[PDB]
Amino acid sequence: GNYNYLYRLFRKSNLKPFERDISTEIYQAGSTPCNGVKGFNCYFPLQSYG
Amino acid sequence: YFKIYSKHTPINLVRGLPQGFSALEPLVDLPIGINITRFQTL
Amino acid sequence: LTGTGVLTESNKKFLPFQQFGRDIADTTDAVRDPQTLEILDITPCSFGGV
Ligand SMILES: *[C@@H]1O[C@H](CO)[C@@H](O)[C@H](O)[C@H]1NC(C)=O
């Protein structure tokens, strides 16, 4: 499993043309706040290719 | 694309701007390609 | 920037950022040669009704 390639599965807003976002900010995929700590409906923005 | 314009003019007013016309000539088209929203001078 | 016309010496002066000059219809009236920094007028060669 070559997990060296990743993609931004989760993002809050659509990108502008020729935009790069290397920000390591967590996403809140539920009503429950994450506040930078993983948990329930709190997943990493970048997911590795299997 | 980050484009620079400029114009150098000899002035002799002590405090404020003069009144007149002077167009600005482009110098550098700098290819940075980054998000810019808040800047700070020196 | 291809085209067709008569190339003659130019009396106009181009500022250093200027590379070509467009007329009202935005056809290249005067051009700057990329090898020798000299300005050339492009007069379209004669047309008329027969
Ligand atoms: C090559 O082109 C430059 C313009 O970018 C000019 O200044 C130079 O004289 C030219 N050299 C020759 C050998 O044609």
Q: What this model shows, in words?
A:
This is part of a larger assembly, with 3 copies of chain A. Chain A has a two-stranded antiparallel sheet with strand order 1-2. Chain A is built from no helices and 2 strands. Chain A starts with 5 loop residues before the first strand and ends with a strand. By secondary structure, chain A is mainly beta. Chains in contact: A-B. At the A-B interface, loops of A face loops of B. Bound molecules: 2-acetamido-2-deoxy-beta-D-glucopyranose. It is classed as viral protein.
Task: Indicate the topology.
This is part of a larger assembly, with three copies of chain A.
Chain A: E1 6-8, E2 46-48
Antiparallel strand pairs in A: 1-2
The complex binds 2-acetamido-2-deoxy-beta-D-glucopyranose.
Protein name (chain C): Spike protein S1
PDB class: viral protein
Keywords: SARS-CoV-2, glycoprotein, fusion protein, viral protein, Beta, B.1.351
